[PDB]
Swiss-Prot record:
<feature type="compositionally biased region" description="Basic residues">
    <location>
        <begin position="86"/>
        <end position="94"/>
    </location>
</feature>
<comment type="function">
    <text>TJP1, TJP2, and TJP3 are closely related scaffolding proteins that link tight junction (TJ) transmembrane proteins such as claudins, junctional adhesion molecules, and occludin to the actin cytoskeleton. Forms a multistranded TJP1/ZO1 condensate which elongates to form a tight junction belt, the belt is anchored at the apical cell membrane via interaction with PATJ. The tight junction acts to limit movement of substances through the paracellular space and as a boundary between the compositionally distinct apical and basolateral plasma membrane domains of epithelial and endothelial cells.</text>
</comment>
<comment type="similarity">
    <text>Belongs to the MAGUK family.</text>
</comment>
<protein>
    <recommendedName>
        <fullName>Tight junction protein 1</fullName>
    </recommendedName>
</protein>
<feature type="domain" description="PDZ 1">
    <location>
        <begin position="7"/>
        <end position="94"/>
    </location>
</feature>
<comment type="subunit">
    <text>Homodimer. Forms heterodimers TJP3. Forms a heterodimer (via PDZ2 domain) with TJP2/ZO2 (via PDZ2 domain). Interacts with OCLN, CALM, claudins, CGN/cingulin, CXADR, GJA12, GJD3 and UBN1. Interacts (via ZU5 domain) with CDC42BPB and MYZAP. Interacts (via PDZ domain) with GJA1. Interacts (via PDZ domains) with ANKRD2. Interacts with POPDC1 (via the C-terminus cytoplasmic tail). Interacts with HSPA4 and KIRREL1. Interacts with DLL1. Interacts with USP53 (via the C-terminal region). Interacts (via ABR region) with F-actin.</text>
</comment>
Length: 94
């Protein structure tokens, strides 16, 4: 089995944010298995991330900051604090 890794720079659209929601984290595992990966849980239809990220995608980094085994509030924190641009590294189970 194989994962696929690439980076995207999401361009903020005021009123819409970066157009993604995330679940997962040290304290809020998305997975039955107990895996703590921060997970792309939704992409706003036609939003800043449409056609670039997908649901159940896994987040490794946000703005050069590793999302390895972090608390959920910490990942959100990194998105919120971005500028006009949020660089996001992902891993896809495809």
């Amino acid at each position: 089995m194989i994962w696929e890794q690439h980076t995207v720079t999401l361009h903020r659209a005021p009123g819409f944010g970066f157009g993604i929601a995330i679940s997962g984290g040290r304290d809020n595992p998305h997975f039955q298995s107990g895996e703590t990966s921060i997970v792309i849980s939704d992409v706003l239809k036609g939003g800043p991330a449409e056609g670039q990220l997908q649901e159940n995608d896994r987040v490794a980094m946000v703005n050069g900051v590793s999302m390895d085994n972090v608390e959920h509030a910490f990942a959100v924190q990194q998105l919120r604090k971005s500028g006009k641009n949020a660089k996001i590294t992902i891993r896809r189970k495809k």
